[PDB]
Design a protein around this ligand. Structure first.
Ligand SMILES: NC(=O)c1ccc[n+]([C@@H]2O[C@H](COP(=O)([O-])OP(=O)(O)OC[C@H]3O[C@@H](n4cnc5c(N)ncnc54)[C@H](OP(=O)(O)O)[C@@H]3O)[C@@H](O)[C@H]2O)c1
Length: 310
């Protein structure tokens, strides 16, 4: 009834599917824009069975976007890095429609307006900021979400639980702190704040105290969980730096993220600004799945590994 109608772009995506599910679970009328040449047919069928309205089309269909924007209240973009400036197509429709109550561009990472990485990653951040400036310039109501590290994503990446190897690779010293959150919670919380007046025109950061850790600490705890000690092999920072300069694109981009995440610890290298909102504090009936709980999940039923597109 009163439920805001939510439109999600990139809904079949890695993090996008969680926003679609949390939206439906929260009883929000949910529209999912997806490409006709969709290969996520089985996932779309699932969304459909959950009550979601599927809208096939291309971002180039400006008029379709405009007429669609008119039927919804909230717009969330969970598009991949390759499609970042394409968000200007979504932005143009919103502007023409004029009725959008909240717009969440595709961030869901580190806090771009307060951290600096190597040229490769610095370039992608610059783009996100371009989007942000355009949003504020037009006075479009928004919410900037810094979700920090996708947990299942990085546990698979750093621990390779689907590989009984005796060694484990540590980037840099492994002493750098970072925060990692379960993908399911990132989705649910993003939907909550997209309608939370407390997040209107604000930067929301997902940093629950129970999800801050270093590579070494993560490894050490995984070891206790499974009762197996691993041989640690470090990759010097200087080597990671050289690679970002040598390796081509997009190969060198995740190399720059790794340095920024696990070597620089850009997800913990800053203190909260006055206007910042840390989401775990917003809802007493909700909580982020903790690291220990996450390790438990990877023991009882580990989720499959995944790689982001660059
Ligand atoms: N913080 C972290 O640890 C972390 C990790 C990974 C990603 N991220 C961030 O999360 C956001 C989304 O990442 P993601 O990996 O979830 O995205 P993704 O799964 O790679 O892609 C999202 C969706 O984009 C649509 N799409 C793909 N190619 C397209 C094209 N050429 N034109 C139009 N639409 C296209 C697809 O949907 P359809 O097939 O339905 O059209 C796809 O499912 C990004 O901003 C990314 O940087 C953060």
């Amino acid at each position: 009834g009163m439920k805001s109608k939510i439109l999600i772009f990139g809904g079949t995506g890695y993090i996008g599917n969680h926003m679609v599910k949390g939206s439906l679970k929260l009883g929000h009328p949910t529209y999912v824009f997806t490409r006709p040449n969709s290969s996520k047919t089985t996932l779309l069928d699932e969304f459909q069975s959950l009550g979601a309205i599927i809208v096939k089309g291309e971002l180039d269909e400006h008029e379709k976007l405009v007429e669609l924007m008119k039927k919804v209240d909230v717009v969330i973009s969970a598009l991949a890095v390759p499609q970042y400036l394409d968000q200007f197509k979504i932005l143009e429709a919103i502007k023409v429609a004029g009725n959008i109550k909240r717009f969440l561009p595709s961030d869901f990472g580190v806090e771009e307006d307060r951290i600096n990485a190597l040229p490769p990653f610095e370039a992608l951040i610059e783009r996100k900021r371009m989007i942000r400036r355009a949003i504020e310039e037009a006075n479009i109501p928004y919410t900037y979400v810094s979700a920090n590290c996708f947990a299942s994503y990085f546990i698979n990446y750093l621990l390779r639980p689907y590989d009984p190897k005796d060694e484990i690779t540590v980037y840099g010293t492994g002493e750098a702190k970072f925060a990692m959150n379960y993908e399911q919670d990132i989705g649910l919380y993003t939907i909550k704040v997209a309608t939370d007046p407390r997040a209107l025109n604000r930067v929301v950061i997902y940093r629950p105290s129970t999800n801050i850790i270093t590579q070494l600490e993560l490894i050490s705890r995984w070891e206790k969980k499974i009762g197996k000690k691993f041989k640690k092999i470090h990759v010097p920072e200087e080597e990671i730096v050289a690679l970002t300069k040598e390796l081509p694109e997009p190969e060198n981009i995740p190399i720059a993220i790794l340095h920024c995440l696990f070597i620089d610890g850009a997800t913990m290298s800053y203190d909260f600004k006055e206007n910042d909102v840390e989401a775990s504090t917003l809802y007493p009936e909700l909580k982020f799945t903790t690291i220990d709980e996450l390790l438990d999940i990877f023991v009882h039923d580990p989720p499959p590994p995944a790689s982001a597109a660059f």
